[PDB]
RNA sequence: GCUACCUAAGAACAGCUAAAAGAGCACACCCGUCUAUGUAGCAAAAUAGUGGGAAGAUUUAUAGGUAGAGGCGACAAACCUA
RNA sequence: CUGAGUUCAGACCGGAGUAAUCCAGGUCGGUUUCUAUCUACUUUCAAAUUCCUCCCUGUACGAAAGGACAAGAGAAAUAAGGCCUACUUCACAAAGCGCCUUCCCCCGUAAAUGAUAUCAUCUCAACUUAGUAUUAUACCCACACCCACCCAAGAACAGGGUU
């Protein structure tokens, strides 16, 4: 028989259980605020060719941003919510080219997770997370699981890649799916307005694999490359990324350093393993801006 | 695509949808308990609470009166809304209606729902009730609650 | 946005533009890879039964925010070499032309008002 | 008490925190540049620095005809007839290049949108560029101009006679016949007014906005 | 577009005996504590609801009898009283509905 | 008993403009220009819109007549029980 | 899906024919329906091209007239993939007319050293450079109950959330 958590609970037991589990989650999250005080994995200086871990952020929405030159750039707000390192795998163990870090984001209910996942998080001592994404790293970039990740990991002027599931448009015809021109409205055209024309050629008694036909569009992973980080809000853990990222608002996006060859070795100035707030050397302000960004509270710009 | 579409498409169109909901709402005000298809009931529910809010807004208010005149086809119900239903709910800020799924209709096997205004004179529904506190699981958890409060 | 076969208002001192004619000047061609023409885009007109080059200076279609939008589609007649046909422009002219790539200094010089 | 339109969010699934962040940014900008209370009827003069020129200062005077957008991106279109030519410019409030915003005349028209001025006679869209500001007394309700504009011939940019636009500021009697009136009335949608699930109650929202504004000050 | 060939019973059996086509077993079924008849969870018990509906109908018949004709909705609250019951202090100033039978156990 | 034509005795044609009509606009009524729908259809020829005519060489009910080597025809080889 | 032609049932013109009728001549008008059984297929993806302007430079070159190539910078257009802050169609959202992003090379020859043929010779000689070779990296990747409810997920199913 099917069972949910609060099926067999009393009227007064439901609020108690809710409070109990919520408090435990809060405690577990608060426990991990100081990774350096706990026994850390060795921190190495940055080297050319090294790749560091990324983050999982929530797409808040978009706002305009201005520059001193006067150009307006739209930016997307990515909030980092309960982002922790979950798992490390060595290159030999993974049977892959590089070491991997599994990183999770956005805490969710314990009641709605499978036993396997619950057991894994129990061993960690962290509340379960909505999405887990895998980041290919070098050995020198290894971070102990349980370590929190913050928006200040990225810095303004840096370029990032953003990966999310696109907005699902469901089943779509050729015109919305592939931008087929369709057929004219009048001058006949009995039942042909939005139809695919000739699907294939006469001679082949078949249709080629991968022909553009009506089907399900959206709801697939896409990556946006070379998006500039304009601003960090350290208080709320907000990353301001240039332009639009895939997916709906309140979705979870995978943010890593840009893979583009132009921005290959620009990781020199960035905090290598991650940013550790508990280090407390030159405590960062609320807002980190790029040089070009017109900060709010600044005087009105004149083009001199 | 229908992302963020909040209203169902029912009847012969938009006006027809309003008219269908209006009839269900009139039925509810008169009878205080209505059986109807689940989706139609769910659609009407929102309007039911909004009507009570306008009822609360006052008899003398012209805006509320206009709304009440529209939504109640039978005019005798308009006093009832202002003088019976609105004073009843003066204490609470919402949750005026109660909706419960009913066994499917005989003829067309439609999903069905009962909607009532709370505190009606009619015999109480066989509402679903959570398990007693004296059950084994509830006893164990009561023990846990006691231990936690003793710890503090 | 000015396309082929768009009726156009000539905002110029030129005799060709201002002289009475049965039909309004009409866009023959737009000198851009996509047919769409905006402010600072050279076009070719059918005016007074002759083919003549013109430059777009404001149009009805909305653009970037701070840029002005005009109630009428406005052009200035130019010769093949590039110099303006007419001597004066009474109608206000956007300042966005200066930064735009092309020969806009002649037109701005002969213009009297900027919006 | 007047709250700027952009502060009040349009309904949706957007996280409240996004609005908080945008609001604080708006409030810093307001500290730098005073944005006066104005309505759609109001006549405004906007002072701006233009990137095309070498930091030169541009003044543009006109009647506001539309206030739209929410948050930092909020805009207003203001319209004026300059030497025979009707020009509209769409100004972003929180654009840092905006030096100064002055309300020359503060008023409300009968309609919330004045886009029909495009199809109205030019005289209604023409304002003196060098008109001196008129000052309102500190304690008084904002005046409403009950002006009905005369129109050009029937082909218009939009079908203003249609009830969806809900225009109350046009002499429809002059430019339209009763046949045209009844033709328009076929699009009435009388039920739409009484649809009380379509209503957006911005009471609690506005209160929370006001708390944050007074906190910022 | 017509079938080029008759579909066989072997292929047809494969189509129509597919798990997708088959009726799924329900795990929602529980005994109603009140009456002992089977109820689907998440749904009101049919038997109990039928009982309540029968009583509601009887009361409504009485309401209609007392009102007399249409458009006679009272401007006061209503209360239902059975045999051997008198109005209380709360019930005073309410419309009284009289029933010829005794109080149901479930009715409170 | 459909239809082509005829015979007998009938019926119908709002409103508006018109010196007043095989006149015009335009109902009812008659027809079927063009498009769309429909194509085992509502229909073995229809529907919706748009159309042509609508006091007349008009439309229409009833009864009668002309019969196949034939009838009837403002000739379309039309119609004479799909 | 749709013109015209073959191509016709009606009609006229020019020509032919005693005629009926014909034209290998012209012009007007003119009905093909289909509910998909089988095969095949229904987000391979993650690598974009080009033009113009400026610098070089008004250089090299050339008697002048004229007028480059590499390297770099800026602007566009298209294509592929997304998105909604504004603008626009509109309004819990979907869209473009709006915004954002876009990464590797190609092999024909040009040359060293050097035998057969003690010189020479770029080599279907052994060989040495331009030469880049197998590109690579990116994405995806844990699995309750499958009461119910909600959803930015969706035809059904499936998927995400319900602390
Ligand atoms: Mg098309
Ligand atoms: Mg069609
Ligand atoms: Mg057809
Ligand atoms: Mg839906
Ligand atoms: Mg329906
Ligand atoms: Mg238009
Ligand atoms: Mg007679
Ligand atoms: Mg008459
Ligand atoms: Mg006549
Ligand atoms: Mg007539
Ligand atoms: Mg005849
Ligand atoms: Mg003939
Ligand atoms: Mg013939
Ligand atoms: Mg026959
Ligand atoms: Mg025809
Ligand atoms: Mg699930
Ligand atoms: Zn029961």
């Amino acid at each position: 028989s099917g069972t949910w958590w609060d099926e067999h609970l009393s009227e007064e037991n439901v609020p108690f259980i809710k409070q109990l589990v919520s408090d435990e989650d809060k405690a577990q999250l608060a426990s991990k605020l100081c990774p350096l005080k706990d026994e850390p994995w060795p921190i190495h200086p940055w080297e050319p060719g090294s790749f560091r871990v990324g983050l999982i952020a929530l797409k808040l929405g978009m706002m305009p941003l201005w520059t001193k030159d006067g150009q307006k750039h739209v930016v997307t707000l990515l909030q980092v919510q309960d982002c922790h390192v979950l798992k490390y795998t060595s290159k030999e163990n993974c049977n892959g080219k590089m070491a991997t870090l599994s990183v999770g984001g956005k805490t969710v209910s314990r009641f709605r997770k499978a036993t396997s996942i619950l057991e894994f998080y129990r061993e960690l001592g962290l509340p379960p997370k909505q999405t887990v994404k895998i980041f290919n790293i070098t050995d020198n970039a290894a971070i102990k699981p349980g370590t929190p990740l913050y928006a200040a990991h990225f810095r303004p002027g840096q370029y990032v890649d953003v990966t999310a599931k696109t907005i699902g448009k469901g089943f779509q015809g050729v015109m919305k799916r592939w931008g087929f021109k369709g057929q004219p409205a009048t001058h006949g055209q009995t039942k042909t307005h939005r139809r695919p024309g000739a699907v294939a050629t006469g001679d082949i008694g078949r249709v080629w694999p991968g022909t553009k036909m009506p089907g399900k569009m959206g709801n697939i992973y896409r990556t946006e490359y070379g998006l500039k980080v304009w601003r960090i809000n350290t208080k709320h853990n907000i990353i301001y990324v240039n332009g639009s990222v895939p997916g709906h608002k309140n979705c979870l996006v995978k943010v890593k350093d840009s893979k583009l060859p132009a921005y290959k070795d620009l990781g020199k100035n960035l905090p290598f393993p991650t940013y550790f707030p508990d280090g407390d050397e030159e405590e960062l302000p609320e807002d980190l801006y790029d040089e070009n960004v017109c900060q709010p509270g600044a005087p009105s710009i004149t083009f001199a | 695509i229908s992302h963020g579409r909040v209203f169902r498409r029912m009847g012969l169109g938009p006006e027809s949808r309003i008219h269908l909901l209006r009839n269900l709402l009139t039925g509810l005000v008169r009878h205080e308990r209505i059986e109807a298809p689940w989706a139609r009931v769910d659609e009407m529910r929102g309007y039911a609470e909004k009507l009570i809010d306008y009822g609360k807004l006052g008899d003398t208010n012209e805006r509320a009166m206009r709304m009440a005149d529209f939504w109640l086809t039978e005019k005798d119900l308009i006093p009832k809304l202002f003088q019976v239903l609105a004073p009843r709910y003066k204490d609470q800020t919402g949750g005026y209606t109660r909706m419960l799924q009913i066994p499917n209709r005989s003829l067309d096997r439609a999903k069905m729902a009962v909607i009532e205004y709370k505190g009606n004179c009619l015999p109480p529904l066989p509402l679903p009730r959570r398990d007693s506190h004296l059950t084994l699981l509830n006893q164990l958890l009561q023990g846990l609650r006691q231990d936690l409060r003793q710890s503090q | 946005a000015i396309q082929k076969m768009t009726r156009v208002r000539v905002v110029d001192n030129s005799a060709l533009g201002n002289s009475p004619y049965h039909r309004a000047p009409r866009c023959i061609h737009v000198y851009k890879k996509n047919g769409v023409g905006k402010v600072g885009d050279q076009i070719l007109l059918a005016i007074k039964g002759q083919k003549k080059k013109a430059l777009i200076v404001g149009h009805c279609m909305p653009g970037p925010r701070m840029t002005p939008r005009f109630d009428s589609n406005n052009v200035v007649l130019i010769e093949d070499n590039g110099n303006p046909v007419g001597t004066r422009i009474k109608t206000p002219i956007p300042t966005s032309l200066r930064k735009r790539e092309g020969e806009y200094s002649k037109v701005l010089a002969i213009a009297q008002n900027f919006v | 008490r007047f709250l700027s339109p952009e502060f009040i969010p349009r309904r949706g699934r957007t996280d409240p925190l996004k609005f908080q962040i945008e609001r604080k940014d708006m409030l810093e900008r307001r500290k730098v540049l005073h944005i006066p209370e104005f309505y759609v009827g109001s006549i405004l003069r906007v002072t701006t620095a233009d990137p095309y020129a070498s930091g030169k200062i541009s003044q543009f005077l006109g009647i506001c005809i539309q206030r739209s957008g929410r948050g930092l991106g909020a805009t207003f279109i203001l319209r004026n007839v300059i030497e025979g030519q009707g020009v509209e410019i769409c100004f972003e409030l929180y654009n840092p290049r905006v030096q100064e915003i002055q309300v020359v005349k503060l008023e409300k028209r009968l309609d919330d949108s004045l886009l029909y001025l495009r199809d109205a006679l030019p005289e209604y869209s023409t304002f003196d560029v060098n008109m001196k500001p008129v000052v309102q007394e500190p304690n008084q309700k904002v005046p409403v101009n009950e002006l009905k504009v005369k129109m050009k011939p029937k082909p218009w940019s939009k079908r203003w006679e249609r009830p969806n636009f809900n225009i109350k500021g046009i002499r429809f009697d002059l430019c339209l016949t009763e046949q045209q009136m009844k033709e328009a009335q076929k699009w009435n949608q009388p039920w739409l007014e009484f649809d009380m699930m379509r209503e957006y109650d911005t009471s609690k929202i506005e209160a929370a906005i006001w708390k944050e504004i007074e906190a910022s000050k | 577009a017509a079938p080029k060939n008759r579909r066989t019973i072997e292929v047809n059996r494969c189509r129509r005996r597919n798990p997708q086509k088959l009726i799924k077993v329900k795990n929602n079924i529980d005994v109603c504590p009140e009456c002992g008849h089977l109820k689907q969870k998440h749904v009101l018990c049919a038997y109990c609801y039928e009982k309540v509906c029968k009583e509601t109908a009887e009361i409504r018949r009485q309401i209609g009898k007392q009102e007399g004709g249409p458009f006679k909705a009272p401007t006061i609250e209503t209360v239902v009283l059975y045999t051997g019951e008198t109005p209380s202090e709360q019930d005073q100033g309410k419309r009284i509905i009289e029933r010829d039978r005794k109080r149901p156990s479930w009715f409170t």
Side-chain angles (χ1 to χ4, degrees):
Chain A
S1 185
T3 307
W4 55 105
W5 68 279
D6 67 322
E7 188 190 18
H8 304 301
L9 300 192
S10 283
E11 301 88 53
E12 57 265 48
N13 268 7
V14 176
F16 156 71
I17 286 297
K18 280 184 181 184
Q19 192 62 258
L20 181 72
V21 294
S22 69
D23 290 349
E24 197 203 329
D25 295 330
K26 281 161 75 69
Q28 280 176 340
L29 281 178
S31 173
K32 296 287 177 76
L33 257 292
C34 290
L36 291 182
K37 268 80 181 182
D38 297 314
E39 310 97 315
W41 287 11
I43 294 154
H44 300 132
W46 178 87
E47 287 175 309
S50 63
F51 306 119
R52 57 169 200 172
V53 74
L55 267 73
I56 296 173
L58 189 142
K59 185 191 174 163
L60 274 187
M62 298 178 92
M63 68 162 69
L65 192 141
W66 285 275
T67 60
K68 287 167 171 72
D69 74 76
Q71 197 182 351
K72 188 209 92 177
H73 305 96
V74 68
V75 296
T76 306
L77 283 87
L78 302 182
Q79 191 195 13
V80 182
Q81 295 186 36
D82 297 315
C83 191
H84 290 90
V85 171
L86 257 60
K87 198 192 287 176
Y88 170 77
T89 320
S90 298
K91 51 205 297 301
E92 53 268 10
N93 299 353
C94 191
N95 306 302
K97 301 145 192 177
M98 301 193 79
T100 62
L101 279 176
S102 291
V103 160
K106 175 80 180 289
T107 190
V108 287
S109 175
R110 274 151 94 180
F111 304 126
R112 306 302 176 165
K113 280 289 158 286
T115 309
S116 310
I117 289 104
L118 280 172
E119 275 167 9
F120 163 76
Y121 276 103
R122 190 182 57 181
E123 301 312 317
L124 274 167
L126 275 168
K129 294 170 188 311
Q130 190 180 326
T131 59
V132 186
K133 294 294 164 67
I134 294 156
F135 299 87
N136 304 348
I137 60 143
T138 60
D139 290 328
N140 74 326
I143 299 161
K144 183 173 168 76
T147 303
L149 300 173
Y150 299 92
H153 172 88
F154 303 108
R155 290 299 159 97
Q158 183 205 335
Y159 292 91
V160 291
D161 303 330
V162 190
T163 314
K165 279 166 96 57
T166 55
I167 291 163
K169 315 270 194 73
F171 202 109
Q172 287 313 304
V174 285
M175 283 189 74
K176 199 192 264 282
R177 204 185 183 203
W178 310 107
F180 282 17
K181 273 183 270 173
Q183 290 83 33
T186 64
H187 298 295
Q189 309 305 127
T190 56
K191 300 284 211 67
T192 62
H193 301 302
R194 299 190 72 85
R195 293 182 72 177
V199 168
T201 297
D203 193 27
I204 66 162
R206 65 185 184 97
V207 175
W208 280 101
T211 55
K212 291 169 195 290
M213 296 183 106
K216 299 211 197 294
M217 78 164 282
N219 204 30
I220 55 156
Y221 290 100
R222 290 292 193 206
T223 310
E224 210 67 38
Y225 299 94
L227 304 182
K228 201 187 167 299
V229 176
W230 285 104
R231 177 152 96 88
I232 301 296
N233 180 34
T234 66
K235 205 182 87 65
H236 290 108
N237 286 6
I238 316 289
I239 314 154
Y240 290 80
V241 292
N242 183 240
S244 53
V245 310
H248 60 95
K249 63 194 81 181
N250 310 296
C251 77
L252 291 169
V253 303
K254 177 183 183 185
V255 194
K256 78 172 279 180
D257 300 341
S258 181
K259 73 165 271 280
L260 293 183
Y263 318 120
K264 186 171 281 294
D265 296 324
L266 293 183
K268 191 176 278 178
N269 299 333
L270 302 177
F272 174 58
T274 186
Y275 169 74
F276 296 91
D278 56 344
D280 202 21
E281 73 284 356
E282 200 272 321
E283 181 58 51
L284 289 189
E286 182 176 345
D287 301 314
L288 299 167
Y289 298 88
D290 187 44
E291 55 182 59
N292 302 119
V293 172
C294 280
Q295 313 188 8
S300 290
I301 48 158
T302 52
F303 307 99
Chain B
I1 309 146
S2 68
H3 304 328
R5 305 304 190 196
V6 293
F7 308 125
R8 301 191 210 277
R9 295 155 60 191
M10 47 179 69
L12 305 164
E15 182 172 358
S16 188
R17 171 187 161 279
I18 285 302
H19 288 198
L20 282 189
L21 294 175
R22 195 168 63 171
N23 279 40
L24 288 173
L25 186 47
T26 296
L28 186 59
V29 167
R30 177 171 299 282
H31 296 289
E32 289 185 327
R33 187 183 290 166
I34 289 311
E35 272 174 42
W38 189 97
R40 290 186 173 104
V41 167
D42 190 50
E43 196 77 353
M44 183 215 52
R45 187 158 180 213
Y47 293 94
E49 285 109 1
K50 290 280 177 77
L51 188 72
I52 296 301
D53 295 325
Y54 281 145
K56 281 180 184 184
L57 203 62
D59 183 17
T60 56
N61 192 355
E62 66 283 1
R63 214 269 169 178
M65 182 58 73
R66 277 180 75 258
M67 194 67 55
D69 181 37
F70 176 88
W71 280 99
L72 302 173
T73 62
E74 307 156 339
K75 300 312 169 189
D76 62 320
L77 289 192
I78 297 159
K80 172 165 184 167
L81 172 69
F82 287 110
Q83 293 173 58
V84 180
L85 286 174
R88 184 191 296 183
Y89 299 130
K90 71 172 169 72
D91 58 317
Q92 64 175 12
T93 55
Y96 314 120
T97 51
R98 177 185 307 165
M99 181 181 166
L100 288 163
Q101 193 179 343
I102 288 314
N104 299 296
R105 200 149 61 176
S106 61
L107 180 64
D108 60 342
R109 307 306 307 188
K111 195 186 176 190
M112 287 293 286
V114 66
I115 180 142
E116 75 172 20
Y117 273 129
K118 286 182 183 175
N120 56 64
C121 63
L122 301 163
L125 290 164
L127 272 92
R129 209 194 302 273
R130 282 189 188 271
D131 281 331
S132 182
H133 195 78
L134 295 166
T135 63
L136 204 140
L137 173 63
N138 289 309
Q139 283 318 287
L140 287 164
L141 285 182
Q142 178 52 231
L144 181 73
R145 189 216 270 268
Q146 277 168 12
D147 273 35
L148 260 295
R149 69 152 60 88
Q150 273 166 9
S151 296
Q152 304 303 311
Chain C
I2 308 309
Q3 303 185 135
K4 289 164 88 167
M5 287 199 80
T6 295
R7 283 99 182 102
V8 131
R9 173 186 133 139
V10 174
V11 292
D12 207 2
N13 198 12
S14 59
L16 194 76
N18 287 321
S19 65
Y21 208 67
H22 54 272
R23 60 181 85 264
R26 177 187 68 256
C27 181
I28 280 174
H29 184 265
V30 180
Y31 296 97
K32 209 159 96 188
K33 281 175 182 285
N34 62 327
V36 174
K38 309 286 203 189
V39 183
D41 303 359
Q42 198 175 27
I43 63 154
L44 183 61
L45 285 180
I47 176 164
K48 279 182 74 72
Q50 78 188 64
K51 303 192 277 283
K52 181 68 79 177
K53 312 272 284 305
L55 178 81
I56 301 161
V57 284
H59 48 69
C60 304
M61 193 195 247
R65 292 311 83 71
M66 311 298 281
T67 67
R69 176 213 161 274
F70 295 84
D71 280 340
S72 53
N73 307 312
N74 297 317
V75 303
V76 171
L77 292 175
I78 48 175
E79 292 174 8
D80 294 349
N81 61 9
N83 61 13
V85 173
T87 319
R88 291 291 187 269
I89 304 164
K90 191 146 202 170
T91 304
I93 294 314
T95 56
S96 67
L97 285 179
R98 202 189 179 195
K99 281 278 179 286
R100 279 215 73 253
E101 283 74 19
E103 321 270 304
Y104 299 113
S105 297
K106 310 272 194 76
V107 172
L108 291 175
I110 65 155
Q112 76 159 351
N113 270 110
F114 300 114
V115 162
Chain D
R1 206 182 189 179
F2 166 80
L3 185 57
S4 272
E6 56 272 18
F7 281 96
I8 309 139
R10 285 174 169 276
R11 69 210 297 198
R13 298 178 79 178
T14 308
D15 201 319
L17 171 69
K18 189 266 177 175
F19 296 120
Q20 292 171 21
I21 293 308
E22 194 157 8
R23 265 181 267 123
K24 63 183 76 182
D25 297 346
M26 282 188 266
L27 287 162
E28 272 107 35
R29 182 52 191 163
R30 281 187 170 266
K31 284 172 190 285
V32 173
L33 159 75
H34 170 253
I35 306 161
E37 168 188 35
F38 70 94
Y39 294 91
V40 159
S42 307
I43 293 96
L44 270 81
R45 187 184 277 152
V46 184
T47 301
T48 321
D50 62 339
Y52 312 107
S54 189
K56 302 278 177 71
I57 291 313
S58 311
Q59 276 84 359
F60 193 73
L61 189 139
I63 180 170
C64 185
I65 55 162
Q66 196 191 73
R67 286 200 76 167
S68 58
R70 307 290 193 269
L72 273 174
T75 58
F76 60 96
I77 308 170
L78 60 92
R79 173 169 174 80
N80 198 307
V81 174
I82 292 91
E83 60 198 345
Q85 177 78 49
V87 184
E88 305 170 338
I89 304 181
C90 191
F91 289 105
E92 313 199 283
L93 288 107
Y94 301 103
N95 201 326
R97 77 161 79 162
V98 173
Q99 300 295 116
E100 197 275 331
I101 307 155
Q102 180 190 350
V103 178
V104 173
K105 193 189 278 286
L106 176 73
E107 62 173 12
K108 315 174 89 175
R109 291 283 207 94
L110 285 157
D111 305 296
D112 64 312
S113 172
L114 283 178
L115 290 184
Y116 59 75
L117 280 182
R118 288 172 186 176
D119 301 307
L121 288 171
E123 58 154 319
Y124 303 110
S125 309
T126 321
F127 292 92
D128 180 38
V129 66
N130 295 120
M131 67 170 77
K132 296 287 170 287
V134 282
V135 63
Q136 306 290 337
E137 60 272 29
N139 189 28
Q140 194 62 36
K141 62 165 290 301
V142 52
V144 180
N145 189 11
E146 291 87 13
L147 171 66
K148 315 275 207 82
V149 297
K150 290 169 183 72
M151 298 295 289
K152 295 194 280 290
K154 182 55 204 76
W156 293 332
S157 74
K158 299 273 180 169
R159 290 150 166 164
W160 309 115
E161 68 280 355
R162 295 280 176 90
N164 75 92
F165 289 97
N166 195 0
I167 303 302
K168 294 190 280 291
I170 293 171
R171 299 288 296 277
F172 283 119
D173 60 312
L174 266 85
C175 54
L176 292 166
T177 72
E178 62 83 18
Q179 191 276 337
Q180 284 173 298
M181 289 287 96
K182 67 179 180 179
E183 187 75 18
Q185 280 306 303
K186 284 189 276 185
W187 271 267
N188 193 236
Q189 288 191 315
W191 67 85
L192 197 77
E193 187 196 337
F194 297 112
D195 190 54
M196 54 190 171
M197 277 288 284
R198 200 173 279 107
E199 296 168 353
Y200 187 34
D201 183 32
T202 63
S203 297
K204 265 60 71 184
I205 293 152
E206 280 183 8
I209 312 301
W210 273 120
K211 282 184 82 184
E212 287 189 48
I213 286 172
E214 70 190 3
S216 77
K217 291 183 70 59
Chain E
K4 208 91 191 73
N5 280 107
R6 181 182 173 277
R7 280 204 296 205
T8 54
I9 194 47
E10 291 83 5
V11 304
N12 289 343
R13 272 199 211 94
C14 285
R15 176 180 71 265
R16 52 178 92 127
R17 285 174 200 232
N18 198 327
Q20 193 272 335
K21 295 293 169 86
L22 259 61
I23 298 162
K24 311 275 159 70
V25 185
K26 293 189 180 196
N27 310 110
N28 312 344
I29 324 300
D30 280 331
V31 177
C32 170
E34 304 301 322
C35 68
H37 293 80
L38 299 171
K39 71 178 294 303
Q40 202 150 325
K41 290 194 281 294
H42 89 266
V43 178
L44 256 65
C45 167
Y47 186 94
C48 282
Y49 183 64
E50 210 286 326
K51 166 175 65 61
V52 173
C53 278
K54 277 282 166 80
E55 196 56 32
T56 305
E58 260 296 324
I59 288 169
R60 275 175 185 167
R61 282 180 194 94
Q62 284 287 299
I63 284 172
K65 194 174 281 291
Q66 197 189 329
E67 278 188 21
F71 320 118
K72 295 288 178 71
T75 191
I76 55 167
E77 284 279 351
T78 310
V79 67
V80 174
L81 293 187
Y82 289 75
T83 67
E85 285 199 337
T86 60
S88 75
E89 65 282 347
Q90 286 182 309
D91 293 359
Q92 200 173 52
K94 285 177 148 65
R95 187 180 67 175
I96 318 291
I97 304 299
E98 301 287 356
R99 290 285 299 121
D100 204 12
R101 70 182 290 274
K102 270 301 295 173
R103 283 290 287 258
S105 60
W106 45 273
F107 196 118
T108 58

